[PDB]
Amino acid sequence: MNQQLIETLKSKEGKMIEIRRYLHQHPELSFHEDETAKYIAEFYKGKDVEVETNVGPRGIKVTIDSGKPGKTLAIRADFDALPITEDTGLSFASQNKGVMHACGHDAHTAYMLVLAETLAEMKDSFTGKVVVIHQPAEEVPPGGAKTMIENGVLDGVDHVLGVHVMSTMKTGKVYYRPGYVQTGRAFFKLKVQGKGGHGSSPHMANDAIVAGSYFVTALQTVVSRRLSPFETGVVTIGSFDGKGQFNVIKDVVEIEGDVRGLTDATKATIEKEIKRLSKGLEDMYGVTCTLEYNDDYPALYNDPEFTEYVAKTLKEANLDFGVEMCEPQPPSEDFAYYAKERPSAFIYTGAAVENGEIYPHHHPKFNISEKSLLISAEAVGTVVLDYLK
Template identity: 30%
Template sequence: MESYVIEARRQLHMYPEIGFDLDRTLTFLKSELDKMGVEYTEKYGKSSIVATINPEKSHFTIGVRADIDALPITEETGLPFASKLDGQMHACGHDAHAAIVLDTCRRLNEMRDKINCRVKIIFQAAEEYPPSGAKLMVEDGVMDEIDCIVALHVAPGKNVGDIAILAGPENATSDGFHLEFYGKTAHAAAQNEGVDAIMMAVKAYTEIEFMIAKEIRAIDPIIFNVGAINGGVANNIICDHCSMYCTLRTHRNENEEYILDKIKKIINSVAEVSGGRAEFVLDKHYPMVVNNEKMVERVKHSAEKIIGKEHIVSQIRGMGGEDFAYFANIKPGCMFQLGVCEPGTKCTAGLHNSKMMIDESALEIGVNLFVQFVLDNMNGIDFN
C-alpha cells in the first residue's frame, strides 16, 4: 500500500485533463475533501477549488496553491499508471503539485486544533492555457482574505531531497500570441494574381528574429519561439491565410514592451508591402514571479528542519512562465523548486516531455515542507 500522496498522484496522473475541462479531476479532489470534512468553494475563477481549514481563525491566513491541469501530449513513460486519456498527459508535474497540496490539506486538517491560523488550499485550473486560471481567481477576489501564499514546482533536473529557491524575480515575463496573415488565393502558375500568406509569415518571422538579434542588448535574456505555422490547402494554390503561434519570454518588462510593439509594426509593414493584411492577437500574458524576500527567508527556515540547510540550493533565474505571478503580485508569495530526480541518476526527460517522470519519494518532502511552513508561521509574519 503506497502512501496517501503517492496514491493521489497516481490517480490524478492516469486521468490528466486540460485547461478548464477538469470534470474528473475536480470530482476526485472534491470527493477527497468531503472525506476529510474540509469545507470548500468553487466561486473563484473557473473549474477551480478553494478549501479552508480553520475558517474562524481569520487573524492570519496562509494560502497554499497547486495547479491541476495537464498538457496535450501523448505519454511515453511506460508507467503502470500512465495516462488513460489519448493525447493528454501530466507532463509538467501538476499531478504531483495537486497531490502534495491535497495531502498537505489532509495533514493540516488532522491537526487543525493545534494550528493558530486559517489556511486556504487553492486548486487552480488552466495554468497552461489562456485565460490564466490564476488571473480569473484573482479577479474574483481569491486573495482578499489571504495574507501570504506559497507554491512549489517539480524540478526534474534537481535531486530528490533538494529544493531550489530564489528571492526576487524568479522567472520570465511570458507572452503567448498568434499572428494572422491574410492574402489572396490564385493558381500557383499565376502567382502574380495572388497574395501569398505563407510568404508573409516567413518574411515576418525572419524580420522578427533579425530585430531581436540586432536591437536588443546581447546580455538580456530573450526567447522568441514559433511553435506552429498553419497555412495552405494544396501545393498548387497560393495560400490566402496563414497563422503563426508564438511565445516571447524576457527578463525585462521594457524589452517585452519594445519587442511586442516592433512585432506589430513588422507584420503590418510586411502585409502592406505584400498587398495583404496582418493581425496580432495576444492569447496570454504571465508577469514574472517575484518571490518576496521575507517569504523566501521563512520557507528556507522551514526547509532546514525538513531537509537540512545543505539541501537548500540557489536557483538560477529561468525563462519559464508561471501564472502563480498573479497571486504573488497581490500578496507576499514564494514559489520554490522541488527536486524530483533520483540521486545518482541522470534525468533525461524534462518538463513538457512525453517521457517525463518523477521520483515519487519527493512528494512526501513537499508535503512535510508545506506543513512545517504553516506550523512555523501560523502566528503571523511581519512584512514591514
C-alpha cells in the first residue's frame, strides 16, 4: 500500500503548493480564523470523510473511517497566523495587512488536506480510523488544542502525531526526539509597591525602582544557581514599568516576565524560586509585592515508545528523505496539550530555503522550501499506513 501512497502523493504535489499559496495569501489571526476554517471544511466537500465542525470555536475534526475495526491515530495540523507584517518577497504574500503565516501553518494545512484526501481513497489499505485535526489558535494563549480537547477531539484516539516545518533545519530529511522536545511556558506580573515621596528626602520614602532593580539582579540566580546546568530554563523580564517624574521617588513599579522550562520539573522549580525571591523582597526592602503567576503551555513530551516507533517505521520504509535525531527546540507549542492527554510524537520536516538568507519563525522574512510539503505528507502517510495496518 505504501508504494501506491507515495506516487499518489507525488502526483498531487502541485496541489499542495497551490493550496499553501492561497492560504499564505489569506492569513487570519488566532481566534479570528473565520475564512480559513470555512476553506478547510469546504475542501472536504465531495470527499468520503466525516467532517465535524465547531469542535473548538473553529475546531475541525475530519474522520476517515476505514469501515473496519482497529486503532485510531490522530494527525494534527494548525492553521492560525500571526500579527506580523510580511516582507517576503513573494507574489502570494499576505493581502491581510499586518498578519502573516510566519510559522508555516499554511504549509501544515496544505499537506494535511492533500494527505487526508489521499488516505480517504485508500480505506482498502488500513483498519480503524484516522482523525485529522485542523487546529486554530495555536499561537496565542489559551490556544486551540485545549479548547479542542474540551470538545472531545481525542475521543477514541490512541495516539497523536504532528509535524512542524522547520525553516532552520536542512531540507531533505525529517527530525525526531523522544521525551521533552519543546519548552513549556509561564507568565508573571509583579507589582512592587513602596512609598513615593519628594526626591530630596529618600529616608521618608521607600524606593520601588531600587527594590525592583535589586529584584532583577537577584532573579538571575534562578537560572544561574537554582537550576541544574543540564536543565533548560529561561527567566526574562521583558517589562520593567517604572516611568516617573525626575525628582519624585517612585512609589510603584510593574514588572512583567516570562518563563520557559524544557521539563515540567524545571517549570516547577522556576516558579518556586521566583515566588521565594518575590516574597523575600518584601522583607528585604519593606515593599509589598503582588505576584500573579500564570502557567501556560506545558513542555512538549514526545512519548518514547511511540516516537521511536515513528522513527523506526520511517527508516524501514525507505523514502526519498533521511530520518535522524535532533536537539530540543526553544519555542513553546500547544501540541504539548495533546502530548499530555495521549502518547504523542511531534516531529520536524526540514524546510530551510536552498538559496538566499535563512530566517527563523515569526520573522517578517520567514520562508520555507516548498518541498517540505511532499516530505511531510509522505512521512505522515507512511506512519498512518504502518500504524493501523
